[PDB]
Short mmCIF file of C-alpha atoms and ligand atoms in Angstrom, two decimals:
data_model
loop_
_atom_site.label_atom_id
_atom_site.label_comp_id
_atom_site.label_asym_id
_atom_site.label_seq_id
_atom_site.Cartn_x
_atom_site.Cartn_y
_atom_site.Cartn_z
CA UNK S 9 19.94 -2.45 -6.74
CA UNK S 10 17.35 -0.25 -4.44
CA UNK S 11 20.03 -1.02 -1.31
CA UNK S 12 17.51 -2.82 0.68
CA UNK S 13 18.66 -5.28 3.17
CA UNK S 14 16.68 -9.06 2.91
CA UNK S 15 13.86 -9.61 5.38
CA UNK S 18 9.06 -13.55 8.14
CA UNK S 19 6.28 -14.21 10.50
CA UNK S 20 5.51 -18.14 11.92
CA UNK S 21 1.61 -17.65 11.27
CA UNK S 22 2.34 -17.49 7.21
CA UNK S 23 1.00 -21.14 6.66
CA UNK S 24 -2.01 -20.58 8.93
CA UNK S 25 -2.95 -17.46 7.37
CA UNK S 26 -2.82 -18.33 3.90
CA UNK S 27 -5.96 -20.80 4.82
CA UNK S 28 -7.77 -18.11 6.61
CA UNK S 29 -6.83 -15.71 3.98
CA UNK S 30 -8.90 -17.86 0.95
CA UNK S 31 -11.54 -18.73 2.68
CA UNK S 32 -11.73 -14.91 3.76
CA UNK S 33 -11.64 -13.87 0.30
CA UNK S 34 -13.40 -16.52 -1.42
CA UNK S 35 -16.50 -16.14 1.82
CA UNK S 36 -16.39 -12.40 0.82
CA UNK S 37 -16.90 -12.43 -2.73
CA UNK S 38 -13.49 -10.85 -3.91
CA UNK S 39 -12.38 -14.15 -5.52
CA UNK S 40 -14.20 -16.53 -7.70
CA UNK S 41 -13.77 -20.18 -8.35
CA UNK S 42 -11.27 -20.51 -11.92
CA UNK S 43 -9.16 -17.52 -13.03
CA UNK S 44 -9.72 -15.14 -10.56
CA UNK S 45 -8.93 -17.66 -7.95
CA UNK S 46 -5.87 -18.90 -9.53
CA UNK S 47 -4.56 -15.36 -10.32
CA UNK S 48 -4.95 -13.83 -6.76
CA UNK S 49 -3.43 -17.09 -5.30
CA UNK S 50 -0.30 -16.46 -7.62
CA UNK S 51 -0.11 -13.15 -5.76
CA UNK S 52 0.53 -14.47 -2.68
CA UNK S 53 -0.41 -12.02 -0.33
CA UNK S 54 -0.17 -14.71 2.65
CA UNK S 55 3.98 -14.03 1.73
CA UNK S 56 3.21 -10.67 1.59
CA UNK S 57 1.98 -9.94 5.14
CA UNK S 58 4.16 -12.82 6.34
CA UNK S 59 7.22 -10.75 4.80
CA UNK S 60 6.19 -7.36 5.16
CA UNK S 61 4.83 -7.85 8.13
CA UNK S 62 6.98 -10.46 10.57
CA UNK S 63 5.85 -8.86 14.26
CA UNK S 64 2.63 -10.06 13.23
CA UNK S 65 1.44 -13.25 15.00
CA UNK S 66 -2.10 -15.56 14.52
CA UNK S 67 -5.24 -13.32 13.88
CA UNK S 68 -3.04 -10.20 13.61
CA UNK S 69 -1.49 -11.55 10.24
CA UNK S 70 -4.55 -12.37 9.29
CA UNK S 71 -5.75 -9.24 9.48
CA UNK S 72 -2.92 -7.96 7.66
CA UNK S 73 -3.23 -10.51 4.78
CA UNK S 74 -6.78 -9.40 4.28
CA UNK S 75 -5.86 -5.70 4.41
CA UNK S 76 -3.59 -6.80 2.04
CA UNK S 77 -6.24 -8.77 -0.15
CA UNK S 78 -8.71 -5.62 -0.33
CA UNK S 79 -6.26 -3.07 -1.01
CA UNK S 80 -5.13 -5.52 -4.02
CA UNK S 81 -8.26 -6.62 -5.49
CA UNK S 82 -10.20 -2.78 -5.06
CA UNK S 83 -6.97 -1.41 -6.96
CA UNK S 84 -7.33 -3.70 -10.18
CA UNK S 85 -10.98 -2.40 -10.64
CA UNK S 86 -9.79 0.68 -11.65
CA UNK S 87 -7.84 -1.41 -14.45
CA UNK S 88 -10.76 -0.47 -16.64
CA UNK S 89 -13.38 1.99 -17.74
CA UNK S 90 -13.85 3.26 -13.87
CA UNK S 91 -10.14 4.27 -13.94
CA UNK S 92 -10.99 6.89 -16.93
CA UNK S 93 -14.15 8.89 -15.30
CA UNK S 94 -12.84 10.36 -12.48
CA UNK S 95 -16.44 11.69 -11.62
CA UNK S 96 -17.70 7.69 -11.34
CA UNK S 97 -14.21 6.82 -9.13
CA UNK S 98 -15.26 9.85 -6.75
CA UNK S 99 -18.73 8.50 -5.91
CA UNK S 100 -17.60 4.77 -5.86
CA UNK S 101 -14.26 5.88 -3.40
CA UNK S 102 -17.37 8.19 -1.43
CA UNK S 103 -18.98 4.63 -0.71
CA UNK S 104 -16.19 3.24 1.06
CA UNK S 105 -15.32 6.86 2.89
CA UNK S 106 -18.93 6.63 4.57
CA UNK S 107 -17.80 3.08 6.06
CA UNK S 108 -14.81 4.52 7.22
CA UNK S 109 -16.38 7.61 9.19
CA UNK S 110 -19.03 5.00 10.96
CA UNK S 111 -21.97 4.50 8.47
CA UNK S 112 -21.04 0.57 8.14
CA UNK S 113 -22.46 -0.96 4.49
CA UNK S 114 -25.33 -3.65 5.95
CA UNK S 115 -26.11 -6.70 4.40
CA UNK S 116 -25.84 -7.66 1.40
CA UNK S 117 -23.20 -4.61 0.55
CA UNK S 118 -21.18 -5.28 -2.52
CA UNK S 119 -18.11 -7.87 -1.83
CA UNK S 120 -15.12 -4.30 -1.51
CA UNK S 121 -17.60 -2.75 0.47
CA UNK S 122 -18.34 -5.95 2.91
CA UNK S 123 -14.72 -6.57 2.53
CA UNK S 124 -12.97 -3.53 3.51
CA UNK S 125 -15.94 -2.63 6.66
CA UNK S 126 -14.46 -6.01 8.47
CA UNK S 127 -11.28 -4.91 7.79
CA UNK S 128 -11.63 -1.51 9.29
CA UNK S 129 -13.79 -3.16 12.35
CA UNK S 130 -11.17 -5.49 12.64
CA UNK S 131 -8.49 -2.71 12.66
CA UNK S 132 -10.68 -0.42 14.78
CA UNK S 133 -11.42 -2.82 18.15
CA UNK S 134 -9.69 -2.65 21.30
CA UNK S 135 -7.50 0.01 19.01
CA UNK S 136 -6.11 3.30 20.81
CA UNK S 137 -8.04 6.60 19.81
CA UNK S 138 -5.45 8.34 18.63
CA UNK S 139 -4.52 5.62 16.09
CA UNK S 140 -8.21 5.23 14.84
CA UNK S 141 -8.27 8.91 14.64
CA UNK S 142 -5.46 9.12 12.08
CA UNK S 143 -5.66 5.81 10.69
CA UNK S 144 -9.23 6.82 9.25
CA UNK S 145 -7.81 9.94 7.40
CA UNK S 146 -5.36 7.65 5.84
CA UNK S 147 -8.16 5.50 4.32
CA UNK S 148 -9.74 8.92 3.38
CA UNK S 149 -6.89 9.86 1.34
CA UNK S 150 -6.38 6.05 -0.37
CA UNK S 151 -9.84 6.28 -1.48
CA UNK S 152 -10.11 10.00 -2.11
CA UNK S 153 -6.71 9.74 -4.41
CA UNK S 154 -7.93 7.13 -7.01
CA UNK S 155 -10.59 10.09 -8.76
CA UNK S 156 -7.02 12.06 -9.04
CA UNK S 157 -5.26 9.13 -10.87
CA UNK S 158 -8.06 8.77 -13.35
CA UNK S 159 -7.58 12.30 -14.10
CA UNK S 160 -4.20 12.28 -15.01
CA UNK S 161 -5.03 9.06 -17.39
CA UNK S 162 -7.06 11.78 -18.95
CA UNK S 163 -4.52 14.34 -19.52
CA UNK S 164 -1.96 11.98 -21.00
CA UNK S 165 1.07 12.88 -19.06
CA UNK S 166 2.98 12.53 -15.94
CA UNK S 167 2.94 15.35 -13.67
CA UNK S 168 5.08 17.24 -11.63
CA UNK S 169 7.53 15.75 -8.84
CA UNK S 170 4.91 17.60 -6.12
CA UNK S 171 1.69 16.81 -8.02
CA UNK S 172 2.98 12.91 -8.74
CA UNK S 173 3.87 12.46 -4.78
CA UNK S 174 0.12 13.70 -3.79
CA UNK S 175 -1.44 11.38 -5.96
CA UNK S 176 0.78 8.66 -5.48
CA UNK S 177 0.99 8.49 -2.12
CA UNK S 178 -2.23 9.04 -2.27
CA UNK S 179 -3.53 5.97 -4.01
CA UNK S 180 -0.33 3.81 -2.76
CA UNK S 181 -2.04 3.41 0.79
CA UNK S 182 -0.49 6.22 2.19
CA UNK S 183 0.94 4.91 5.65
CA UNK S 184 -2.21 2.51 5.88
CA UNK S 185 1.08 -0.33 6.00
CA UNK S 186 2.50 1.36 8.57
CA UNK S 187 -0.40 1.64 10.62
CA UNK S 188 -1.67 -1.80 9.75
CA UNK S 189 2.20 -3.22 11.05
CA UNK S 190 1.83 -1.09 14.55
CA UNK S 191 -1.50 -2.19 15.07
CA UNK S 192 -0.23 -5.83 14.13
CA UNK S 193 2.35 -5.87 16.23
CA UNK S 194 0.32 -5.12 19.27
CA UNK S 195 2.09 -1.43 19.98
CA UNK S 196 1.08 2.32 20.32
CA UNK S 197 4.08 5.03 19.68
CA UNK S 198 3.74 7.07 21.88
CA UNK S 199 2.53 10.61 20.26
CA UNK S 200 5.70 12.42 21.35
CA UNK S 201 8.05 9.55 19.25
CA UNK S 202 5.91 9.68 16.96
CA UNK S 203 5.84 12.99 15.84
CA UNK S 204 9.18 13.81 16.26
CA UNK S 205 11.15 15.07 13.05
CA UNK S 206 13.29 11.91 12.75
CA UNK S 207 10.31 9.62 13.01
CA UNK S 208 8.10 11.67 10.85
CA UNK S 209 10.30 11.77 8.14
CA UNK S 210 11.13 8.25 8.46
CA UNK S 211 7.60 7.15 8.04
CA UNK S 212 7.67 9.43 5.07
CA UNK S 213 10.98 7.87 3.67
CA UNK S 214 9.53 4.20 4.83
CA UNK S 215 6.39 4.49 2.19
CA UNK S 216 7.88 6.77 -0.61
CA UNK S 217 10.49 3.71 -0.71
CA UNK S 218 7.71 0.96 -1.03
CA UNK S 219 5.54 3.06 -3.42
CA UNK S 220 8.81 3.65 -5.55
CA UNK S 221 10.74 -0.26 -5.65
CA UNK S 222 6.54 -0.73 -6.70
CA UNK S 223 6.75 1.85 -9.83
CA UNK S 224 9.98 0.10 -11.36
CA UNK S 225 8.45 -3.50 -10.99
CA UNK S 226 5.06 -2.13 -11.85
CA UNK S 227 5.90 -0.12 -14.79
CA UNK S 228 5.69 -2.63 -17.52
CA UNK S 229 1.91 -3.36 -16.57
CA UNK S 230 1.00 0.17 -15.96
CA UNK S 231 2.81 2.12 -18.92
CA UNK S 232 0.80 0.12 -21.67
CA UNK S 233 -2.95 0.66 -19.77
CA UNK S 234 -1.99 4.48 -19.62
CA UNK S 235 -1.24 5.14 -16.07
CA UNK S 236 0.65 8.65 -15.38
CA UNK S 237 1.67 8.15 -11.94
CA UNK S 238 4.83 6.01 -11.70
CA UNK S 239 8.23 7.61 -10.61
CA UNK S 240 10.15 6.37 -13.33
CA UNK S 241 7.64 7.98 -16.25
CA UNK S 242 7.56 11.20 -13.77
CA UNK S 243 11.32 11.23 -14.25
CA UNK S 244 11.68 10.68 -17.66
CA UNK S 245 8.91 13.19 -18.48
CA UNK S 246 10.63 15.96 -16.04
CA UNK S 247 14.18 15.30 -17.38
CA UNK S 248 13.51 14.12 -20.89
CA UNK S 249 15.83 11.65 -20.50
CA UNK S 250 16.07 7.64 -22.13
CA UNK S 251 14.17 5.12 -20.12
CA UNK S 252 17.36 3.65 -18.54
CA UNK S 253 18.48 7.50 -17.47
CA UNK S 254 14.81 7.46 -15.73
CA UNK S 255 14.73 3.82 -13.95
CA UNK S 256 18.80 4.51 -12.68
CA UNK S 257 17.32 8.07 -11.68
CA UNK S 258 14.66 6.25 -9.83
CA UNK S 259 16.56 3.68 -7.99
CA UNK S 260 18.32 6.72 -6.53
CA UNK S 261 15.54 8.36 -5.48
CA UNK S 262 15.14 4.64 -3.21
CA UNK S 263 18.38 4.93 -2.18
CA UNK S 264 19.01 8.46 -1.02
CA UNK S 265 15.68 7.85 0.77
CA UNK S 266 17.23 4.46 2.31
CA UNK S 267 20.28 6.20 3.37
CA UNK S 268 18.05 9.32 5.25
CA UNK S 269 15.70 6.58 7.12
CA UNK S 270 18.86 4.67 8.71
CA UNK S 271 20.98 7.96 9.59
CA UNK S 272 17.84 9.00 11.48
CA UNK S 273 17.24 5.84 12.84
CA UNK S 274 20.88 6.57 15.12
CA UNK S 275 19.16 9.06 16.63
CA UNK S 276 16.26 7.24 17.94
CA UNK S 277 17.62 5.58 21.16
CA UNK S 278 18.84 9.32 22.46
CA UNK S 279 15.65 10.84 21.25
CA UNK S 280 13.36 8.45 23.41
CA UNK S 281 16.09 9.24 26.40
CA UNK S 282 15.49 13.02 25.71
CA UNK S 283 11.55 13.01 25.59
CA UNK S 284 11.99 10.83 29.22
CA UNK S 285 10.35 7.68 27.61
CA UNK S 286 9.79 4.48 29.79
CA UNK S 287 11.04 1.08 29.06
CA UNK S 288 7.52 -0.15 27.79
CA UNK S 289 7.28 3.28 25.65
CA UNK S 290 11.42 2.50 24.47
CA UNK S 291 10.10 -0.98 23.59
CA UNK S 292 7.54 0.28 21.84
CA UNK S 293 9.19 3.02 19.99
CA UNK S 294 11.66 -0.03 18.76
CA UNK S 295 9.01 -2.39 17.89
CA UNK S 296 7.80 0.71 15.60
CA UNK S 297 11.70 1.15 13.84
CA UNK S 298 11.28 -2.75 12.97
CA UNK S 299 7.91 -2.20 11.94
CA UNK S 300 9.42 0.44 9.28
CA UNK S 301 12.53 -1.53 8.32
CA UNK S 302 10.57 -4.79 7.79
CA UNK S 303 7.54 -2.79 5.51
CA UNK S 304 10.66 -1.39 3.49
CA UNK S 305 12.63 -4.93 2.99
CA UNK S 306 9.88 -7.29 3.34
CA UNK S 307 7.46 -5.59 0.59
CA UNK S 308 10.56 -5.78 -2.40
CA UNK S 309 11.33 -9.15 -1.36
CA UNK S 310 8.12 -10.11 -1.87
CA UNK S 311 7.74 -8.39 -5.42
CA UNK S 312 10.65 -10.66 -6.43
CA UNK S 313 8.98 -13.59 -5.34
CA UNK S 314 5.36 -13.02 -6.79
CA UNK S 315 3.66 -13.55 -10.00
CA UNK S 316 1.44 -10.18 -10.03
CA UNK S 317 3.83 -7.98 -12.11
CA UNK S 318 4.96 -10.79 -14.47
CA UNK S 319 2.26 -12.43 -15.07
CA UNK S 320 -0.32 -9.82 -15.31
CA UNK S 321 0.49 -8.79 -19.08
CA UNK S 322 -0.15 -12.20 -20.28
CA UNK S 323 -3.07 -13.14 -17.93
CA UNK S 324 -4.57 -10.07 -18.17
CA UNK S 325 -3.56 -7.73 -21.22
CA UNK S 326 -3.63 -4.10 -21.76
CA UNK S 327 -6.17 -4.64 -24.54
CA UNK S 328 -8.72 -5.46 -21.74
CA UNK S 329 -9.62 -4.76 -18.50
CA UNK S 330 -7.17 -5.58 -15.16
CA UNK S 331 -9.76 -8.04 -13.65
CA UNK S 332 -11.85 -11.38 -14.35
CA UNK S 333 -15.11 -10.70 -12.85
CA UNK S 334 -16.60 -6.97 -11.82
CA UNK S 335 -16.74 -6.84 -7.91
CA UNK S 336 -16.65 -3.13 -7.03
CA UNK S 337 -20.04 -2.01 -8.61
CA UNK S 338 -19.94 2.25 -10.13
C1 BTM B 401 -0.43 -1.31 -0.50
C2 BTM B 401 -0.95 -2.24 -1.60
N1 BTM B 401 -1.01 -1.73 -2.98
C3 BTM B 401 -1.36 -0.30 -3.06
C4 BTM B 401 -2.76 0.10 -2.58
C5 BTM B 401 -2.00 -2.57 -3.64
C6 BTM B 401 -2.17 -2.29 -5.13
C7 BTM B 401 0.25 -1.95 -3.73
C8 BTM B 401 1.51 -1.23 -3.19
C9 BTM B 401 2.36 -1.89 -2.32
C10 BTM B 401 3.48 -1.25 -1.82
C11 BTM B 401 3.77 0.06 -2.19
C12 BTM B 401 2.94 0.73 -3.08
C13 BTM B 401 1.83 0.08 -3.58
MG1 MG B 402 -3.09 1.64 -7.99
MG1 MG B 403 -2.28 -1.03 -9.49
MG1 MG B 404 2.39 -0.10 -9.29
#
């Protein structure tokens, strides 16, 4: 029990066609296993669920956001994820695409993948939101040399040190950008930074990335990973693995509880900072944006195959992938 209400966008059927041939046109996905294991993720449900403002080529997008962010992850299911000095120069590859030096032809299938997604993201996009939207993807790929060091050391770290890395290599609020964007709005910079929506952003992806550790943990915990909230807890506490996961579905909840009290507040904030009706509409489109990440993302964990399947597809005793696609 996180405390998360239930959720989808019309365009799920249509972009689950796209989606394949995207990924299969791109390289990311074979013919066979691979195929048939990314398929049983279904990350057309995912951006359908997590993502239900989104309508035609705007869930697409988000489905093939989706589709890079889950297929450049499980390459680090492997030797890449334990040299931290070969993840920096791989993740330094995709940084250069994101600061304008696009990959040309012929660039391997996460590089060609992830340019069209940021081109995609990028056109007829406000400047402000490309602005921070490209230090987010600098931090998602930056984060992954960080994660491969703490597979090194052995142990969990710190609350602080496990937030920085995790949300980090979680996306950071690349979702939440990717939903705004999606659903066709701009928050206006003076919503947007307030104190309530700040810290509901923050609350809105430290939820996601957290439901994620507990449903995650049994395919992480036996390939060595060290950043997972409920081995963080138990490590900090030195408490029994049920102490840790009942610990950890409070840290969801108390997180939960702080978005929706400071969600109240937003209709008398917008009146406050002298909003328009557009900006108002906006500024609402970008709560649902938030609430829908937040539900839509854990009932979609429920629903796939990823975190079940992947010990018996894919076992600790080998690498987390079929084919190599990201080359170090
Ligand atoms: C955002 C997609 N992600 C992380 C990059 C792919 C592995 C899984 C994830 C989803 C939701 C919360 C945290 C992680
Ligand atoms: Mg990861
Ligand atoms: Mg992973
Ligand atoms: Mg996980």
């Amino acid at each position: 029990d996180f405390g998360l209400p239930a959720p989808i966008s019309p365009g799920l059927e249509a972009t689950r066609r796209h989606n394949l041939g995207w990924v299969r046109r791109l390289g990311l996905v074979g013919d066979g296993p691979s195929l048939a294991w990314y398929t049983s993720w279904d990350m057309p449900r995912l951006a359908a669920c997590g993502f239900p403002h989104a309508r035609g080529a705007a869930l697409d997008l988000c489905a093939d956001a989706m589709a890079f962010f889950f297929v450049f992850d499980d390459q680090f299911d492997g030797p890449l994820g334990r040299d931290p000095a070969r993840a920096a120069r791989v993740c330094r590859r995709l940084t250069g695409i994101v600061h304008g030096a696009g990959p040309g032809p012929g660039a391997d299938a996460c590089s060609a993948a992830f340019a069209d997604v940021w081109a995609r993201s990028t056109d007829g996009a406000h400047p402000g939101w490309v602005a921070r939207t490209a230090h987010e993807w600098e931090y998602y790929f930056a984060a992954q040399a960080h994660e491969a060091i703490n597979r090194l050391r052995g142990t969990p770290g710190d609350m602080e040190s496990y937030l920085q890395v995790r949300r980090g290599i979680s996306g950071t609020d690349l979702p939440l950008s990717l939903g705004e964007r999606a659903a066709g709005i701009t928050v206006p910079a003076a919503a947007f930074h307030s104190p309530q929506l700040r810290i509901m952003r923050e609350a809105a992806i430290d939820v996601t990335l957290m439901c994620n550790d507990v449903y995650s943990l049994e395919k992480e915990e036996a390939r060595g990973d060290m950043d997972n909230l409920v081995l963080v807890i138990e490590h900090a506490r030195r408490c029994t693995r049920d102490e840790a996961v009942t610990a950890a579905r409070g840290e969801v909840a108390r997180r939960v509880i702080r978005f929706e009290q400071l969600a109240r507040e937003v209709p008398a904030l917008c009146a406050q900072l002298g909003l328009s009706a557009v900006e108002r509409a906006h500024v609402d489109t970008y709560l649902g944006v938030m609430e829908a990440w937040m539900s839509g993302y854990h009932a979609w964990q429920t629903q796939t195959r990823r975190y079940t399947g992947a010990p018996h597809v894919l076992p600790s005793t080998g690498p987390g992938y079929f084919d190599e696609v990201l080359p170090t």
